[PDB]
Design a protein around this ligand. Structure first.
Ligand SMILES: CCNS(=O)(=O)c1ccccc1Nc1ncnc(Nc2ccc(N3CCC(N4CCN(C)CC4)CC3)c(OC)c2)n1
Length: 288
């Protein structure tokens, strides 16, 4: 890993603490980093550090590396988790990201369902969706395809800012081998644009498909997509026209928008730009 000047962070100035989570990918822990906020070199900030597990594979490592490289290339945006730095020298690779205090969106929404712990308002639901649309409109503008959009891969900060995260599978628009059999083999199927598999391509319109599943997750307050449908049956059902039902209490308009995101023809789905303008409208006209 060639030493990167801007980004390296002293390994003796970081103190690891409580675990946060532990997938097949690696593990993430809470940590104190003193001086990661240059210029406030006095002050020690809560951060999350993502690293490998004792049972890591060569592919685990190069994935963590990639996720780090991707984060460097996309700018600061309000609705994207920021990389704060990395320890890459003389010890385990540590990728230091900004800490969200309220966890992932799926657990956040589940925790504040109506009791039959701060219940979600309809405007709050539309607000998350809008925020995430602005995040993705930014990403798409940066030539980045995320490819792993899902409620579990969003973070919620202390002031309820929605932060797109988990760049483990994200790529530059130009860094996907169209048409090869193994391309897109590692995308979660229930969140995946059909053309990702049938055609072995991936574009911003593919991310729109995923965005649509994300919406559904949001309006079911963190439900599981296609319930009672196994992954091995799914695409046969999608080619036949099946699409998830309208969540309770989500509006006809919002449901038309989900459906639009699940159009079989990529170009017929909204753009992120269109989703932002539409959600901007629904949000404001709610408040009034
Ligand atoms: C999309 C992120 N993807 S990731 O970066 O790979 C990634 C993958 C896994 C974990 C973390 C990250 N990263 C990351 N980065 C910045 N901030 C944060 N905050 C954060 C805060 C709380 C939780 N939790 C989950 C455990 C949960 N307990 C509830 C009660 N039960 C008894 C036991 C479990 C509540 C608190 C959390 O876990 C999601 C994350 N996390």
């Amino acid at each position: 890993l060639p030493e990167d000047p801007k980004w390296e962070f002293p390994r003796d100035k970081l103190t690891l603490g409580k675990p946060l989570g532990e997938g097949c990918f690696g593990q993430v822990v809470m940590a104190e980093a003193v001086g990661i906020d240059k210029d406030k070199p006095k002050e020690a900030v809560t951060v999350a550090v993502k690293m490998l597990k004792d049972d890591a594979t060569e592919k685990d490592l190069s994935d963590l590396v990639s996720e780090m490289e991707m984060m460097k290339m996309i700018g600061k945006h309000k609705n994207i988790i920021n990389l704060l730095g990395a320890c890459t020298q003389d010890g385990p690779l540590y990728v230091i990201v900004e800490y969200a205090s309220k966890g992932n969106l799926r657990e956040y929404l589940r925790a504040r369902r109506p009791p039959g712990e701060e219940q979600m308002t309809f405007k709050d639901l539309v607000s998350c969706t809008y925020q995430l649309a602005r995040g993705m409109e930014y990403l798409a503008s940066q030539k980045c395809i995320h490819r792993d959009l899902a409620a579990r891969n969003v973070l919620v900060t202390e002031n309820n800012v929605m932060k797109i995260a988990d760049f483990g599978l994200a790529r530059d628009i130009n860094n996907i081998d169209y048409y090869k059999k193994t391309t897109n083999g590692r995308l979660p199927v229930k969140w995946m644009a059909p053309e990702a598999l049938f055609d072995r391509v991936y574009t911003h319109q593919s991310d729109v498909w995923s965005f649509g599943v994300l919406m559904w997750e949001i309006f079911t307050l963190g439900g599981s997509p296609y319930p009672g449908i196994p992954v091995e049956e799914l695409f046969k059902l999608l080619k036949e026209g099946h699409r998830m039902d309208k969540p309770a209490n989500c509006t006809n308009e919002l449901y038309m928008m989900m459906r639009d995101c699940w159009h079989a023809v990529p170009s017929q789905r909204p753009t992120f730009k269109q989703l932002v303008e539409d959600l901007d409208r629904i949000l404001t006209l709610t408040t009034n």
